[PDB]
Design a protein around this ligand. Sequence first.
Ligand SMILES: [Cl-]
Length: 450
Amino acid sequence: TLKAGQTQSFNDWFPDDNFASEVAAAFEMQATDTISEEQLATLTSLDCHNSSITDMTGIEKLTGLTKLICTSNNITTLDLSQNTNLTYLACDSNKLTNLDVTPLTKLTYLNCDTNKLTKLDVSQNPLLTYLNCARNTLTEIDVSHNTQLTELDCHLNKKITKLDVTPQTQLTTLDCSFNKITELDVSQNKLLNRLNCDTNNITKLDLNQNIQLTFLDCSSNKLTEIDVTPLTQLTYFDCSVNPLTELDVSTLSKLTTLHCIQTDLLEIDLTHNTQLIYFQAEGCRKIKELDVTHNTQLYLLDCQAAGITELDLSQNPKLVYLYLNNTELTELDVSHNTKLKSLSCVNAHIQDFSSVGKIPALNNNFEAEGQTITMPKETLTNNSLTIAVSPDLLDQFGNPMNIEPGDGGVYDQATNTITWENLSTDNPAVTYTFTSENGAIVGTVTTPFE
Ligand SMILES: [Cl-]
């Protein structure tokens, strides 16, 4: 017997006006048109995203539904106990404090991202392939019964301390970022391709079995060491904000992006990463040498704070963005880097900036303030001292710079010397600032005495 049931307006079926109105449009009808229980049951798919819906009461009557999208609404509860034919559920960006999916035994896609869930029970969903409980307030997530899971996103729950994916042998994408995870065993996830476990408390990460990762981000963790040598397919690798002291990327022939910001590395060998486009290594304070000569397609180089006294940029024609601020450089040469839109080398120990004027786009977009130069000491003669202003002090266009002595001292332009009167061994040095006429370059030259 196929019973018709009651026949009434969508507005009478669905108390929420905005919901009734969306269910109506699903049948290409108005909210005030009448429809039967048997008619309502024929709808296999519903999309009411971004509709100002607070209440989904009446959903129990749409029993033919295999797909429900209610994203970007104000829904505080969703009783889906009668919608047992659902295979796809997107209820993300709502105000759900709880969500029961235990009756939905045919469910293969579940997205409840950005809600207020404290528990989530997916143990009755054995066909699950996409679970996304991102941006909830969960403390754990048992996926032990969900063996067909290909993608898991439990990022930004904040309180997750344990994650077990040892049974998820089909996992290709994992995002467990911004939690308190301390151990991640990914050795059974042989098909893994994308891994993001950043912003956790992971101390060890064994990736030896995951030899077909293409994307890896283990940044902001507590990794003392890591072995990426087996991961020959990697194109993007990010291990920033870890206390790693040694990193071996020689096997990563396909690497395009390497981020190792704020790591403790003593050295780094980029010579085999011929395809490298982005190397971002700001705060790699222990590095004292950088050979980017084999990285011929480098588009952006950032090694701020690095202890490099020089940097051979001859082989990097494609460079558009270079960041050398806070380095130990005493020499700069960007003449072969004609694509540069932005150069920055604040707080270095540079004198001659003449190579930068070779690139006219840099005439304006150029910062080189806070230079700190240190000269060999002289002896006094009477209570006085004359010195030659360093000839290497040359600006962007190879012109002299303006000399402002740490004044008791008179700069003589003719002779390009400074003479201070009344100097004391109590205060054992003399200084002068230099500034370029465009104001892009500023520094000091300390000269000790006696
Ligand atoms: Cl009505």
